[PDB]
Design a binder for this molecule. Sequence first.
Ligand SMILES: NCc1cccc(NC(=O)c2ccc(F)cc2)c1
Length: 330
Amino acid sequence: STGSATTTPIDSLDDAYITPVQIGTPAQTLNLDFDTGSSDLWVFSSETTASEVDGQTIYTPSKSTTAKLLSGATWSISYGDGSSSSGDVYTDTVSVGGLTVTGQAVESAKKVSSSFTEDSTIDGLLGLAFSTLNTVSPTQQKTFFDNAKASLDSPVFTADLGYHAPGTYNFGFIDTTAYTGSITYTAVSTKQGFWEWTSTGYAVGSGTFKSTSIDGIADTGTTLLYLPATVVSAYWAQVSGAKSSSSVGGYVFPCSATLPSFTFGVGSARIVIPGDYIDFGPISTGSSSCFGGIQSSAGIGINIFGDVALKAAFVVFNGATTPTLGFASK
Ligand SMILES: NCc1cccc(NC(=O)c2ccc(F)cc2)c1
């Protein structure tokens, strides 16, 4: 089998991407944030504290003839960005772009943190990291990809995120029309439960490439590119007036600037992030200070190849016995 679904930016900045997911019988379609950095499929629901729902579409298990309470199971997740959610668990039929999994754990939120409530466009998350990170207790549950894997034509999914435009998540096949050149594959460590890999270096604009190993995760659920402070300083030093602002929470730059590109290495290959992808717009409405899309990972504890980086590539998440990642230009 295969599946193919379009993923759409939630706003004009590409702050996140939403993909429609069918849950239950008859189907209830929720728009979920596909997150290769976590491993829980959780949804706003009829059980979510009413004061914490503000415009989201909810899953109502009582209206699904295939929903079954997973008795005794609870979940609770705290994401690296400070957001969190928790609740109980149903199993139900879940379909993405025509690919169906029966008996998928659908984690129903009873509580969500304010950042989820405030984002009316995101009805939940669909985790695509390794199932070892799934938070369901006392019986850990599998991700949608892990449940589908054996049925897929090939044990892979691909992320093709757009810049200020829709893109695609494919399951079970590699669309050879979706990228240019060849796909360069690179090794993955699953020891922390992430799609963790090592970039071979970087360049800033037209500058020379610096060969240096940068360990980090391929995370479709993180908006920006978080890299070591040395790398980030070298980037922003090429932008007149850019500075790190403790009051804003990262690097800002004059909105009048034209940003340089940023290149990262995948083996001997190179992915180029155009400068425009690094502009996240005014820090507050009407400001002439703009927020940078490349930020320091100092204090996060891990480097994160988030959407800013991934949207510059066609990315293969290869879930073969030994997982690997593939990157192609597009
Ligand atoms: N998408 C799941 C996932 C996995 C690992 C790390 C994070 N994110 C962070 O740690 C983070 C912290 C501070 C920031 F400003 C931005 C991101 C998220």
